[PDB]
Design a protein around this ligand. Structure first.
Ligand code: NI
Ligand code: NI
Lengths: 193, 188
């Protein structure tokens, strides 16, 4: 029954969307949730739908909290599960959540937040940061909105904001690679700093 | 030196026209470096390096210049007609090739590989609505179709030696992505 529901939710979210990012985060959250003894169905479902309500979305695609909730109930998902998924997605998406350092999140929420931050670092994070700059018309370097300045202002600090022990061990290799990339960039572009 | 003043004059004009500049500035410095090693005419190398994008179809119509427009400005700035002709001949061929043009092309290709080349490919993908991976238009495909071939297309020995270390770092980056995104190669 749970393999059917997860498939229904995966289809529904794919048709709406970006998908590649969310699919990747869903898979990484289930891996961490396994090592962290989290409820795995909760972890996967919330990872698949947490972006659906995000404010950084146009009004044409952005669903409300009630709309997502009712869709889960219509898919057949139980009351305890629905509520817990809603708790995760609301606690991740209020303004300046970062002030509370993922402390109000349950173990399931923590795991979903960690996968999200892991997707923003290493080789994949480097890629996403530069795509974003290209999409928003920002520069490579030499500027406070540039992708280069985003490394020092945000991306290199993320390793110290992980919630779970497994996420912290997974971050070490990714963070190390960013430094090697920055190093290579600094000799590819003499005077970048 | 008259060469120094003339080059400064060109730099200020190009930077003024493009309001990207940062890319063209790197490529000019790298071209001068390669040219010095290869015994090419450095003034021609630097000047061709600075103006060749101005006529490239990439640039928007609100900024892009014709060949004669580039020619007229060079002559107005005091560059001789013999030098102006050589530069024009280089930048039209690029858009076979002389020693000076081979050096400039090599510098262009080098800015497309290594760390800076990884950055530039992903920026372009975001700009045109392309994905990270998944189809023939994505940044990942662009590595395998184009950017990893560039080291076989270097004209000079100097550039080739410089390409070695950049190409290898790029291969380490692909390796890192394959590790962090299991199944990246077959993903739709
Ligand atoms: Ni996200
Ligand atoms: Ni160029």
């Amino acid at each position: 029954t749970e393999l059917k529901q997860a498939d229904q939710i995966r289809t529904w979210v794919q048709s709406v969307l970006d998908w590649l990012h969310i699919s990747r985060v869903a898979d990484l959250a289930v891996y961490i949730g396994e090592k962290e003894n989290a409820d795995l169905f909760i972890v996967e479902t919330a990872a698949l739908v947490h972006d659906l309500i995000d404010v950084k979305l146009p009004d044409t695609i952005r669903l409300s909290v009630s709309e997502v909730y009712n869709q889960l109930v219509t898919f057949g998902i139980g009351k305890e599960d629905a509520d817990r998924v809603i708790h995760i997605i609301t606690k991740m998406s209020f303004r300046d959540r970062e002030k509370l350092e993922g402390e109000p999140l349950s173990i399931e929420g923590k795991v979903v937040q960690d996968a999200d931050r892991l997707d923003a670092i290493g080789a994949v994070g480097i890629a996403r940061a530069f795509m974003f700059a290209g999409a928003k018309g920002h520069g490579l370097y030499g500027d406070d909105q540039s992708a280069y300045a985003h490394f020092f202002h945000k991306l290199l600090r993320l390793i110290d904001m992980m919630n779970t022990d497994t996420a912290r061990e997974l971050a070490e290799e990714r963070h190390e690679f960013m430094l090697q990339y920055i190093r290579q960039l600094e000799k590819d572009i003499p005077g970048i700093d």
